[PDB]
Coordinates of C-alpha atoms and ligand atoms in Angstrom, one line a residue:
X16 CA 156.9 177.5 100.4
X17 CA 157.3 181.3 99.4
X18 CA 160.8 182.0 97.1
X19 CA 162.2 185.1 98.7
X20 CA 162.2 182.9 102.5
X21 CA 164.4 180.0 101.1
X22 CA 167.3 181.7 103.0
X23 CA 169.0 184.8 103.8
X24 CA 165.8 186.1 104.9
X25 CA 166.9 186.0 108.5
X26 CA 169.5 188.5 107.6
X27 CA 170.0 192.0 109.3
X28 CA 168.6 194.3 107.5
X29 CA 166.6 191.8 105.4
X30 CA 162.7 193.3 104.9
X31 CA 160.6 190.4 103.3
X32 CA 157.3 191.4 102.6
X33 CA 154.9 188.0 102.0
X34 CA 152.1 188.9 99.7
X35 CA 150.0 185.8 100.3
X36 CA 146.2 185.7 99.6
X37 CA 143.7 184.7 102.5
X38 CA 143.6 181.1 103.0
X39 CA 147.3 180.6 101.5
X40 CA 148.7 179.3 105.0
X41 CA 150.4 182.5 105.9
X42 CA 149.6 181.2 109.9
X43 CA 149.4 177.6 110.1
X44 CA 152.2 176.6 107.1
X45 CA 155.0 179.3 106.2
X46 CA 154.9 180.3 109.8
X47 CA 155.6 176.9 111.6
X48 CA 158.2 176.8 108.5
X49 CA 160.2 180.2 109.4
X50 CA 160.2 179.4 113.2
X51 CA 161.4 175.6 112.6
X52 CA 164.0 177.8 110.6
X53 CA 164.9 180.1 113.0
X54 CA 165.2 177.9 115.9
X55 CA 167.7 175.4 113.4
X56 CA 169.4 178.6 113.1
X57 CA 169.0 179.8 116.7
X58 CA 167.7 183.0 115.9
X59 CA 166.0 184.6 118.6
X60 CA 162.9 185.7 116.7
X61 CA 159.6 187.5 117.3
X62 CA 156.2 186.9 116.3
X63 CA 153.4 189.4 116.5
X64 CA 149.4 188.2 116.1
X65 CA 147.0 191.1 115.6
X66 CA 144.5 189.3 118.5
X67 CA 144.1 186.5 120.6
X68 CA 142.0 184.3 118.1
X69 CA 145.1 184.7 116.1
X70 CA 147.4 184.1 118.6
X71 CA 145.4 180.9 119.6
X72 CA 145.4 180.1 115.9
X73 CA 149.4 180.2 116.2
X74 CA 149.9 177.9 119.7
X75 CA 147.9 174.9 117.7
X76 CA 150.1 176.0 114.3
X77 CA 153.0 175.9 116.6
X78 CA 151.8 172.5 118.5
X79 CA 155.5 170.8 119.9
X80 CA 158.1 173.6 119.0
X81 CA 159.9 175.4 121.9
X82 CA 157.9 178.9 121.9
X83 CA 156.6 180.9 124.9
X84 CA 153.4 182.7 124.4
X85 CA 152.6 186.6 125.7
X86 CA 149.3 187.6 127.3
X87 CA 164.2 178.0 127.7
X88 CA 163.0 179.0 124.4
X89 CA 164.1 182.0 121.6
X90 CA 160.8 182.8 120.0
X91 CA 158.3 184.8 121.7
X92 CA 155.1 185.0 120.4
X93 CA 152.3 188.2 120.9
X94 CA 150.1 190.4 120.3
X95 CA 151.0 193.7 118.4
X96 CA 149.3 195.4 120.8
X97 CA 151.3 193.6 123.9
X98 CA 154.8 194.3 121.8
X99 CA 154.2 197.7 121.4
X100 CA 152.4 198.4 125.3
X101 CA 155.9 196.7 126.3
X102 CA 158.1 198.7 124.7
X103 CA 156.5 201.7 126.7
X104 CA 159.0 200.8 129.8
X105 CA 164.3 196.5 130.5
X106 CA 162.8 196.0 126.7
X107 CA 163.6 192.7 125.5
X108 CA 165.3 191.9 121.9
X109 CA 165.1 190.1 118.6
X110 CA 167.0 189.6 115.8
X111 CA 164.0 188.6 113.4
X112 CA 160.6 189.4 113.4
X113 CA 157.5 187.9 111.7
X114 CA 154.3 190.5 111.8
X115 CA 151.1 188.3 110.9
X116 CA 148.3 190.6 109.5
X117 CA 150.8 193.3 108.4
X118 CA 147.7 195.2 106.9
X119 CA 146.0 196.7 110.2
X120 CA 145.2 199.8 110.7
X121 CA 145.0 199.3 114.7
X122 CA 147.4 202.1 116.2
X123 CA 149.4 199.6 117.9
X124 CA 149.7 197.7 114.7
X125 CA 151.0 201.0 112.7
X126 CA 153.2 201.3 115.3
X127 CA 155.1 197.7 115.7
X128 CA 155.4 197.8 111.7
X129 CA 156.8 201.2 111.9
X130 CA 159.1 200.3 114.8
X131 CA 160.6 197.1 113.5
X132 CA 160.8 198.4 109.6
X133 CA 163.1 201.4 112.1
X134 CA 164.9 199.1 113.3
X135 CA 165.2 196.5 109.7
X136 CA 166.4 200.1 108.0
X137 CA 169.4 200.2 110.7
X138 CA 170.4 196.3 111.0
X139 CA 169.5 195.6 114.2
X140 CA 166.9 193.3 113.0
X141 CA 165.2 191.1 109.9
X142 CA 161.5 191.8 109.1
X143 CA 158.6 189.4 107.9
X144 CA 155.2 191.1 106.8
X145 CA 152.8 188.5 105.8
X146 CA 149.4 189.9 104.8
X147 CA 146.8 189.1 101.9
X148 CA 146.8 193.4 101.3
X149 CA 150.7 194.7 101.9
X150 CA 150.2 198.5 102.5
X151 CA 150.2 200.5 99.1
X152 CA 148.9 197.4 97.0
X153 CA 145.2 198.6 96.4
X154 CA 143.8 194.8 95.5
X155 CA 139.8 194.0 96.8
X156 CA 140.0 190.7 94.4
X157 CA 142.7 188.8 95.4
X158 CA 142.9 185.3 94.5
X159 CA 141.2 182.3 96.8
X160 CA 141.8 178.8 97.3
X161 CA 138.5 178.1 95.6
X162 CA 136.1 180.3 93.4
X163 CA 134.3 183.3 94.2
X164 CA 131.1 184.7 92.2
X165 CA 131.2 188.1 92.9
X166 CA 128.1 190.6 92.4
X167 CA 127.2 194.2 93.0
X168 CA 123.7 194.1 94.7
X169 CA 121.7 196.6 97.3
X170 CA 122.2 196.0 100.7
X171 CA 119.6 196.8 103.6
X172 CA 121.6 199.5 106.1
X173 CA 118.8 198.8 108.7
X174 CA 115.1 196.9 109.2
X175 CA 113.6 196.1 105.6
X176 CA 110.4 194.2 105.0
X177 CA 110.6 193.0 101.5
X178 CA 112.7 193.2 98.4
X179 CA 115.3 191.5 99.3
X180 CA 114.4 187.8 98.7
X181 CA 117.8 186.9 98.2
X182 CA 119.1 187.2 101.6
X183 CA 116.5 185.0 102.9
X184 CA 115.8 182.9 99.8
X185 CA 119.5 181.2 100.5
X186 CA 120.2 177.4 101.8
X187 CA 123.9 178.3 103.1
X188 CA 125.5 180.2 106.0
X189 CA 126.1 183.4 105.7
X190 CA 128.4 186.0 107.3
X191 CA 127.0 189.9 106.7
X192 CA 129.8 192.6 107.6
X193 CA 128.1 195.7 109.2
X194 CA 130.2 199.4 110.2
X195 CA 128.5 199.1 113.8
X196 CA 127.7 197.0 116.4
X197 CA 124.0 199.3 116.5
X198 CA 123.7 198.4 112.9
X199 CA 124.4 194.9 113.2
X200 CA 121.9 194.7 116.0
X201 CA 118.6 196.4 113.4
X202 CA 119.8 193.6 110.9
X203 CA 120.2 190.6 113.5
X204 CA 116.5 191.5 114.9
X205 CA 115.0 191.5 111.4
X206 CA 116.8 188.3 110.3
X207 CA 115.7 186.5 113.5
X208 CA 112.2 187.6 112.7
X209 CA 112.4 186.2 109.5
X210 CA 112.9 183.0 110.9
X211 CA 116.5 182.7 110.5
X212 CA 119.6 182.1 113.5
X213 CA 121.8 184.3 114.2
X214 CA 125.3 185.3 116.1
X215 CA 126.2 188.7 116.5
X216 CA 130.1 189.1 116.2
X217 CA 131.8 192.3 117.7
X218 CA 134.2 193.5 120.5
X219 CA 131.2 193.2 123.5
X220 CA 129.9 189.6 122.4
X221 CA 133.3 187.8 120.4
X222 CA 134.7 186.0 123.5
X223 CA 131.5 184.4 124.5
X224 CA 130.1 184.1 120.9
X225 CA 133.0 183.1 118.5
X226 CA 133.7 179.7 119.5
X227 CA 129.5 178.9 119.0
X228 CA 129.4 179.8 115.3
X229 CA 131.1 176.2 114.7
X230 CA 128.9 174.3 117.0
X231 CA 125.5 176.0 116.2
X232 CA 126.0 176.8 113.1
X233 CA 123.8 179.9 112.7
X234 CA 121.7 181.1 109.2
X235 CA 123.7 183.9 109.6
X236 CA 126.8 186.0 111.4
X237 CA 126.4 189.5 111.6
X238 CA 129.8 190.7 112.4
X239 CA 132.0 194.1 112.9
X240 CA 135.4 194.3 111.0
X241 CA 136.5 192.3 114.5
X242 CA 136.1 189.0 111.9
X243 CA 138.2 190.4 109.5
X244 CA 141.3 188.8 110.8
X245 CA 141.9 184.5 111.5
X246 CA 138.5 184.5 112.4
X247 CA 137.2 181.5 110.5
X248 CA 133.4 181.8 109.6
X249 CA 132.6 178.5 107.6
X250 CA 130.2 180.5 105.8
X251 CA 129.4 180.3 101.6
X252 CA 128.5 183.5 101.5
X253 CA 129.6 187.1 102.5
X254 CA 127.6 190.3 102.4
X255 CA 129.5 193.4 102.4
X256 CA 128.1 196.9 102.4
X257 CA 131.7 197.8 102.3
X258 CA 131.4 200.6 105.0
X259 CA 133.2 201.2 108.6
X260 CA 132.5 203.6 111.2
X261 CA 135.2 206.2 111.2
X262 CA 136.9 207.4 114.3
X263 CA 137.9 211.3 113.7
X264 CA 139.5 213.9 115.5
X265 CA 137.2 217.3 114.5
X266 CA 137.7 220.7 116.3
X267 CA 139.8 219.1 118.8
X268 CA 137.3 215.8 119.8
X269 CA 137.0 212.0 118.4
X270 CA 133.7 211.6 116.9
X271 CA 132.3 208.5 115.6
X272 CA 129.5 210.2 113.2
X273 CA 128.1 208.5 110.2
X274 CA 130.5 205.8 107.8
X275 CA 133.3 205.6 105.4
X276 CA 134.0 203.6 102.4
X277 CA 136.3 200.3 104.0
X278 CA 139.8 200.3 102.0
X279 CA 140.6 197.5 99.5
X280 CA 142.6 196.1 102.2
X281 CA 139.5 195.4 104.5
X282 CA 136.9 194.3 101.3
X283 CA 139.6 192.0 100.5
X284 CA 139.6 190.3 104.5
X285 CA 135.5 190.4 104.0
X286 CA 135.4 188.9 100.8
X287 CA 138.5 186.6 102.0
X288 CA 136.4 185.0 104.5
X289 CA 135.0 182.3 101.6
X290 CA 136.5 180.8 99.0
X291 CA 139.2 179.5 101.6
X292 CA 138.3 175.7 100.2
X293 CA 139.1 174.5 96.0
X294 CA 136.5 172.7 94.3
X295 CA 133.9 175.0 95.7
X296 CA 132.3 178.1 94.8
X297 CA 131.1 180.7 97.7
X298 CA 129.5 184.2 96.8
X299 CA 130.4 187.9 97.9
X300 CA 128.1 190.3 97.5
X301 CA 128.6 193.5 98.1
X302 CA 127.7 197.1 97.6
X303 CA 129.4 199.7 95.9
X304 CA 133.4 200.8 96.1
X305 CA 136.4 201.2 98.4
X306 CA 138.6 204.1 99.5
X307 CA 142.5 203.8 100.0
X308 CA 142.3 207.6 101.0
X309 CA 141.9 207.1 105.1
X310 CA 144.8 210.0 105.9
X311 CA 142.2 211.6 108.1
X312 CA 141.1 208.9 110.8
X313 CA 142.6 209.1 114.2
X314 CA 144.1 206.4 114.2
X315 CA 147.7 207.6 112.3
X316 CA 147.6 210.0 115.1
X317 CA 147.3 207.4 117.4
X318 CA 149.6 205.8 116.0
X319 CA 152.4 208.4 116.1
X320 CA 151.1 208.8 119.7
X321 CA 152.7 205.3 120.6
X322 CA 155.5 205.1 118.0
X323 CA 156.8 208.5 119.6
X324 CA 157.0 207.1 123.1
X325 CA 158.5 203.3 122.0
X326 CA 161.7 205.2 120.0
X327 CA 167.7 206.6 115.2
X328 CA 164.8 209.1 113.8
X329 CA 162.1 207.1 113.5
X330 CA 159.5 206.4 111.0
X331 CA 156.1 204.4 110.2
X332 CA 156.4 201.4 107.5
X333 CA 158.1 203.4 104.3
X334 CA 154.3 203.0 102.4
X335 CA 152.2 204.2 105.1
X336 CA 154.9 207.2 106.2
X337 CA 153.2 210.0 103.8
X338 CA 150.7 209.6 106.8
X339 CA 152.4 210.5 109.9
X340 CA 150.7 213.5 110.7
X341 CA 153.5 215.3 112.6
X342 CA 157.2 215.5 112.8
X343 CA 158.7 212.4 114.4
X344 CA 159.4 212.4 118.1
X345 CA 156.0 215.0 118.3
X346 CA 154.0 212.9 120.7
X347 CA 157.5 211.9 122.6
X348 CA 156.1 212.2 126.9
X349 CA 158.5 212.3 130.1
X350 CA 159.5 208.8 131.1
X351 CA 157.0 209.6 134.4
X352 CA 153.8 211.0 132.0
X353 CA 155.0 207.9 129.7
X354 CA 154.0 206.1 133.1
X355 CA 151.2 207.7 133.5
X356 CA 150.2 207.2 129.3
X357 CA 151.1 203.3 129.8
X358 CA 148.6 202.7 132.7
X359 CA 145.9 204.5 131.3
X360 CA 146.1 202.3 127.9
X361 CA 146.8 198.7 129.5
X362 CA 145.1 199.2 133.0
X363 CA 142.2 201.6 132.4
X364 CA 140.9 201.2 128.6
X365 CA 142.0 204.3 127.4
X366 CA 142.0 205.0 123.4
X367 CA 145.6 206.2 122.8
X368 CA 144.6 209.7 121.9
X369 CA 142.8 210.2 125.5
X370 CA 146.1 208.7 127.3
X371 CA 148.5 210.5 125.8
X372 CA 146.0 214.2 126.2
X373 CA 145.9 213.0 129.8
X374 CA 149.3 212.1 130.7
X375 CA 150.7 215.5 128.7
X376 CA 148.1 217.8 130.1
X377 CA 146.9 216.7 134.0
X378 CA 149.5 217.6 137.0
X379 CA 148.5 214.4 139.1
X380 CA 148.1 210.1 138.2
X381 CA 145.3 210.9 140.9
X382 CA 143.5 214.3 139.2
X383 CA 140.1 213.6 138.3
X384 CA 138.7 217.1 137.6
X385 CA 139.3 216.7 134.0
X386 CA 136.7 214.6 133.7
X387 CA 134.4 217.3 135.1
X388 CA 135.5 220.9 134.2
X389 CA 135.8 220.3 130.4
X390 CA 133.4 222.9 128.0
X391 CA 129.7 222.3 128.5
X392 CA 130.0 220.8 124.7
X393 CA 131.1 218.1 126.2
X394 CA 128.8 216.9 128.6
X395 CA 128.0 213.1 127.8
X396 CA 124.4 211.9 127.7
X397 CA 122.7 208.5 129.3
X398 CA 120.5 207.0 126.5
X399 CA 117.4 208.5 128.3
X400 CA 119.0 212.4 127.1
X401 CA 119.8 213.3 131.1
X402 CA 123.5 214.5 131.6
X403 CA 125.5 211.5 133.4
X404 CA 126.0 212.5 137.0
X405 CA 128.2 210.6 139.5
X406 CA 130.3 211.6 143.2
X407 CA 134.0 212.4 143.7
X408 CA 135.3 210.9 147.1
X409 CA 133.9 213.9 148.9
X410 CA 130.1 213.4 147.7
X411 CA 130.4 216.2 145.2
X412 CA 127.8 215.9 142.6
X413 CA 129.8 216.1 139.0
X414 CA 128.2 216.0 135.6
X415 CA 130.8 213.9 133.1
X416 CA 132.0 216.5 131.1
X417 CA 135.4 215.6 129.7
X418 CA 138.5 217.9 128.6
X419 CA 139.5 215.7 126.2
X420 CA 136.4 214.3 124.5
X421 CA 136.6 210.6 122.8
X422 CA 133.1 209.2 121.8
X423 CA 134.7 205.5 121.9
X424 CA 134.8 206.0 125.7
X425 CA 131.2 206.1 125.6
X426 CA 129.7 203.8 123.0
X427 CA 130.7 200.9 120.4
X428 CA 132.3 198.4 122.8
X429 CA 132.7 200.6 125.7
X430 CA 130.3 201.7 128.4
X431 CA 130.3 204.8 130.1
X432 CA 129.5 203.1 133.8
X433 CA 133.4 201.9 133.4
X434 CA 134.5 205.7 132.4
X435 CA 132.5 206.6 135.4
X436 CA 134.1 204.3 137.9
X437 CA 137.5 205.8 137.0
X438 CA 136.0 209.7 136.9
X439 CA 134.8 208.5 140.5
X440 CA 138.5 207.7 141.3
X441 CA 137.4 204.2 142.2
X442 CA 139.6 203.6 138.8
Ligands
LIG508 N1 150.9 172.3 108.6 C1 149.6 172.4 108.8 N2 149.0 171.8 109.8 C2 147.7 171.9 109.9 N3 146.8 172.6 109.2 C3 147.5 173.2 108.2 C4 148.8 173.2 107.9 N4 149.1 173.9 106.8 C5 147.9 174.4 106.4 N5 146.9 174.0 107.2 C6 145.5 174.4 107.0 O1 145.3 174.9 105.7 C7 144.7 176.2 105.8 C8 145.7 177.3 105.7 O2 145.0 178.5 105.7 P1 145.6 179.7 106.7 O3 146.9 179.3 107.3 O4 144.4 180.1 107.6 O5 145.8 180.9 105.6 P2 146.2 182.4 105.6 O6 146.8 182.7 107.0 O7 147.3 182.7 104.5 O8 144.9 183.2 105.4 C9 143.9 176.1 107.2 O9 142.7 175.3 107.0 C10 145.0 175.4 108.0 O10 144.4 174.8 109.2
LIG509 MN1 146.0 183.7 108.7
LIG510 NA1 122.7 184.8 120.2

């Protein structure tokens, strides 16, 4: 069990970051080990999972302690999405605080980090980042319970025909890491026509899909970054193209053009996904190099957005606070537009940047014309190229043509008939 949690750990003011590869038993062995502590030492304590697979993860990891669980007992266990979306209202408190997957870059995530490290930095609580990638280590090799043969090879980024052997050519499961859920779709559809099984992963088909990997055990699991995290794979091999699609705010609208480079951090996850069992040897191959540098994606923004309107002077996690894009307290609403912010993230699916250039901007919770009566830039387009149409209350004809422009709202994981049925005010 990790040195620097023997005791004192639990102290205010205590930050003990956990630098523990993938498949060390941050979740299922120190944590049931701190909480056993905590509740000897009747601590009231907090534990944040960055998703419900994880969170699901901890309840069996957890099995027989006194915990409640967050969608008579002293540790509360949620999401960091849940903590944070909380905190945006009789807030509730803790004393010490265990972040699972303290590596995230999910807005909410910056945010609960940069919260509780506010709060560790003035006593008022003790902080526990586990992660296989602590922000500011730069590490895409970390070490595995079992081996890892790692190799450099090129990757299809769509359909291919031949010359590429290897992919098919191979008598274990694999799992293929793709930027997009429309590029995962062109490499699922050749795969299957090559005669191999295969289970899409992403944020439209993980509820109903995940929990089938294990029973059908697929040739292959072409997955998003969503399996990046607790997801567990039982795969031999990982193939890694080592790209994400990048969320950016340009000329005052989130695009989703084109990819990045995927940090260290999230080659590390992809590659951790094997090699999580000794005496075997599992492969990553993957295809060119990372990139630390992600100071321009939205979602530091984003995450100011929240951190502003959960808050002394308050900061993100000391390694990621050269990101911050504006003075603290920036983003900082009215407690009523803060109303207004909090049901458009947890009731209607809002990103964070659309909520908060809502809530600011729009006079009324019930104003719809914004949706309408942006530039005609930002009309949005059905798949057929026709300008979406759809009817206020009063059967006026609008064309969706947002304000505030976030492509998320209208691809990857979301669809624009549920954007439509709020524009409609049918919400
Ligand atoms: N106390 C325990 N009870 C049940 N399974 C455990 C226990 N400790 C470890 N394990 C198992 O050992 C492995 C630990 O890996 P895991 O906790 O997922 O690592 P990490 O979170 O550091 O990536 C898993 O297969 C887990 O089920
Ligand atoms: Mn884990
Ligand atoms: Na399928």
């Amino acid at each position: 069990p990790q040195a620097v949690v023997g005791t004192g750990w639990t102290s205010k003011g205590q930050i003990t970051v956990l630098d523990m590869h993938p498949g060390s038993g941050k979740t299922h062995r120190v944590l049931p080990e701190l909480i056993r502590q905590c509740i000897d030492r009747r601590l009231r304590t907090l534990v944040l999972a960055p998703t419900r697979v994880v969170l699901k993860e901890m309840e069996r990891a957890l099995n027989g302690k006194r915990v409640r669980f967050h969608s008579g007992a002293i540790v509360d266990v949620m999401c960091h999405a849940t903590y944070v979306n909380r905190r945006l209202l009789g807030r509730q408190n803790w004393e010490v605080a265990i972040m699972d997957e303290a590596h995230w870059t999910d807005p909410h995530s910056i945010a609960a980090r940069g919260h509780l490290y506010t709060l560790a930095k003035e006593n008022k609580c003790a902080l526990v980042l586990m992660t296989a990638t602590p922000p500011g280590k730069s590490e895409p090799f970390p070490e595995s319970n079992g081996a890892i043969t790692s190799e450099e090879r090129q990757i299809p980024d769509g359909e291919w025909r031949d010359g590429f052997d290897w992919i098919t050519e191979y008598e274990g499961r694999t799992a293929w890491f793709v930027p997009s859920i429309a590029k995962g779709g062109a490499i699922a559809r050749t795969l299957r026509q090559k005669g191999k099984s295969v289970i899409c992963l992403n944020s439209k088909t993980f509820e109903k899909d995940y929990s089938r990997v294990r029973d059908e055990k697929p040739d292959f699991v072409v997955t998003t970054d969503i399996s990046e995290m607790g997801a567990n794979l039982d795969v031999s091999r990982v193939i890694d193209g080592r790209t994400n699609i990048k969320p950016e705010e340009v000329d005052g609208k989130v695009e989703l053009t084109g990819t990045r480079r995927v940090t260290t951090a999230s080659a590390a996850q992809r590659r951790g996904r094997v090699g999580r069992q000794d005496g075997r040897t599992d492969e990553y191959i993957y295809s060119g190099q990372c990139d630390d540098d992600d100071s321009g994606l939205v979602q530091w923004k984003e995450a100011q957005i929240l951190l502003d309107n959960i808050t002394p002077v308050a900061t993100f996690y000391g390694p990621e606070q050269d990101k911050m894009p504006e003075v603290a307290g920036h983003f900082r609403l009215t407690e009523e537009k803060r109303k207004h912010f909090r049901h458009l993230l947890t009731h209607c699916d809002f990103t964070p940047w659309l909520a908060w250039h809502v809530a600011a901007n729009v006079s009324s919770v019930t104003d719809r014309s914004w949706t309408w009566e942006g530039p005609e830039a930002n009309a949005v387009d059905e798949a057929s190229g026709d300008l979406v149409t759809f009817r206020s209350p009063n059967g006026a004809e609008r064309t969706l043509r947002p304000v505030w422009k976030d492509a998320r709202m209208f691809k990857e994981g979301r669809d624009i008939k549920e954007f439509v049925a709020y524009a409609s005010g049918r919400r």
